[PDB]
Homo-oligomer: A and B are copies of this chain.
Amino acid sequence: SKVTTVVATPGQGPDRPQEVSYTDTKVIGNGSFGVVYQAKLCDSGELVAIKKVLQDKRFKNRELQIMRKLDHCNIVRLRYFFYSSGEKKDEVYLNLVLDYVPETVYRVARHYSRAKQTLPVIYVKLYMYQLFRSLAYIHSFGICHRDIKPQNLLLDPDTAVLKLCDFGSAKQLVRGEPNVSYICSRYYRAPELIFGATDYTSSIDVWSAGCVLAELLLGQPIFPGDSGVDQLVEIIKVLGTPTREQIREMNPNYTEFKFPQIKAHPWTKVFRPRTPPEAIALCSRLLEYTPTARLTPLEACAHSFFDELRDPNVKLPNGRDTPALFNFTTQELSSNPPLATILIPPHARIQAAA
Contact = CB atoms under 8 A, between A and B. Distances in A.
Contacts of A185: 226-227
B258 A59 contact: yes
B196 A227 contact: no
A237 B183 CA distance: 18
A239 interface: no
Contacts of A253: 198
Interface in A114-166: 147, 149
Q: Please indicate which of the listed interface residues A54, A184, A196 has the most CB atoms of chain B within 10 Å of its own CB.
A: A196
A225 interface: yes
Contacts of A228: 180-183
Nearest to A53: B260
A131 to B, nearest CB: 19
A256 B33 contact: no
A179 B226 contact: no
A32 B183 CA distance: 24
A196 B178 contact: no
Contacts of A341: none
Contacts of A177: 255
Contact of A179 (B186, B194, B232, B255): B255
Interface in A211-247: 225-230, 232-234, 237
B260 A56 contact: yes
B182 A227 contact: yes
B233 A32 contact: yes
Contacts of A226: 149, 185-186
B186 A254 contact: no
Interface in A164-214: 169, 177-186, 194-196, 198
Contacts of A58: 261
Interface in A33-85: 33, 54, 56, 58-59, 62
A196 B169 contact: no
Contacts of A195: 182
B198 A233 contact: no
A260 B93 CA distance: 12
Interface in A1-37: 31-33
A234 B58 CA distance: 21
Contacts of A147: 227
A331 to B, nearest CB: 28
B54 A227 contact: no
Contacts of A194: 182
Q: Which of A180, A181, A182 has the most CB of B within 10 A?
A: A182
Contacts of A186: 186, 226-227
A228 to B, nearest CB: 3
Contacts of A183: 227-229
Interface of A: 31-33, 54, 56, 58-59, 62, 147, 149, 169, 177-186, 194-196, 198, 225-230, 232-234, 237, 253-256, 258, 260-261
19 contacts: A31-B230, A32-B225, A32-B233, A56-B260, A62-B258, A179-B255, A179-B256, A180-B229, A180-B255, A180-B256, A181-B196, A182-B227, A182-B232, A183-B228, A185-B226, A186-B186, A186-B226, A186-B227, A196-B196
